[PDB]
Design a protein around this ligand. Structure first.
Ligand SMILES: Cc1ncc(COP(=O)(O)O)c(C=O)c1O
Length: 314
């Protein structure tokens, strides 16, 4: 007899499972709208004066942080925050009044081994390998209007190279890009062989390969970029009590195992008590950047960089 609307940036089948299970557990009529991180961020900004959802589940965390700075989020600290991996303690001190961490993702390349043979080039192992002229028209990555992935790409390259060389690299990469599309289409196009290599979070490439696509994952040489999955309650939510229960729910260990146990999707749990699938990469074995989520969570910085992508890249 209660209600709840979830803006959902995790996979559609996971959104469906999460909301259906919650609805039965609490007798709450639960609806969701699925969208990329940038898509949902845009909706929340546009709907500020009359919100159409109560909680935003999933998506890269810097747009969540930015929404918080813009006054778009409710303050609420779930008791389940205590179970977040301790490496995120300091970040949750600064941002956790309005955004919680519910998973993590590693940024890498997906490559279609069949397309690779057809182009006659070896699988790329470095960022600069993607600039090979043999890759003209064969690279895809997501459009930053819809996709938090592409903001993570920008932030990764800026931390690796400095901003000037980051945008120099992206301009050279743009010459090999066929089109920028929604992240899930990037993944689908790679599996089908419309593209030869893509940049994105690597859990999707593990799922694609397990489901029979000729796709391999590459962790690019050098420092590794990554993302956190955010969850935030929307300011002036219609259904605040149910939004808090849903927040507690997605912060719980069992809920963070449901993606791999029930859907073969491999976002890495951030609840210290949850078990990860062996198909997820282990970030502890990678050369992670000391990723400055707090800096790129600035609303000023996020808008400046998205506008700069749109003006300088295309
Ligand atoms: C669980 C999850 N979170 C976040 C993302 C990022 O999606 P997008 O780049 O469209 O914002 C993805 C897509 O790869 C995803 O599968």
């Amino acid at each position: 007899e209660g209600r709840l609307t979830v803006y959902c940036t995790v996979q559609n089948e996971v959104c469906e499972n999460l909301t259906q299970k919650f609805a039965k557990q609490y007798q709450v009529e639960t609806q969701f709208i699925q969208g990329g991180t940038g898509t949902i961020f845009g909706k929340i900004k546009a709907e500020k004066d009359n919100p159409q959802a109560d909680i935003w589940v999933g998506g890269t965390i810097e747009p969540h942080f930015q929404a918080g700075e813009l006054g778009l989020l409710e303050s609420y600290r779930s008791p389940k925050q205590a179970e977040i991996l301790p490496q995120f303690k300091s970040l949750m001190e600064k941002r956790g009044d309005k955004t919680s961490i519910i998973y993590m993702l590693v940024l890498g390349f997906g490559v279609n081994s069949e397309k690779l043979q057809k182009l006659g080039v070896k699988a790329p192992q470095s960022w600069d390998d993607l600039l090979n002229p043999a890759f003209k028209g064969e690279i895809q990555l997501p459009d930053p209007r819809s996709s938090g992935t592409t903001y993570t790409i920008m932030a990764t390259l800026i931390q690796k190279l400095g901003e000037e060389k980051a945008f120099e690299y992206l301009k050279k990469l743009n010459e090999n890009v066929s089109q920028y599309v929604k992240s899930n289409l990037v993944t689908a196009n790679l599996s089908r062989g419309e593209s030869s290599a893509s940049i994105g979070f690597v859990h999707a490439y593990a799922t694609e390969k397990e489901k029979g696509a000729p796709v391999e994952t590459v962790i690019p040489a050098g420092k590794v970029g990554y993302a956190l999955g955010g969850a935030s309650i929307i300011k002036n939510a219609r259904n605040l009590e149910n939004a808090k229960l849903f927040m507690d729910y997605v912060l719980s260990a069992e809920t963070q195992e449901l993606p791999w146990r029930e859907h073969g999707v491999y976002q890495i749990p951030t609840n210290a008590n949850a078990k990860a699938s062996p198909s997820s990469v282990d970030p502890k074995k990678l050369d992670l950047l000391d990723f400055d989520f707090d800096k790129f969570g600035s609303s000023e910085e996020g808008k400046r960089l998205i506008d700069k992508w749109l003006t300088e890249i295309k």
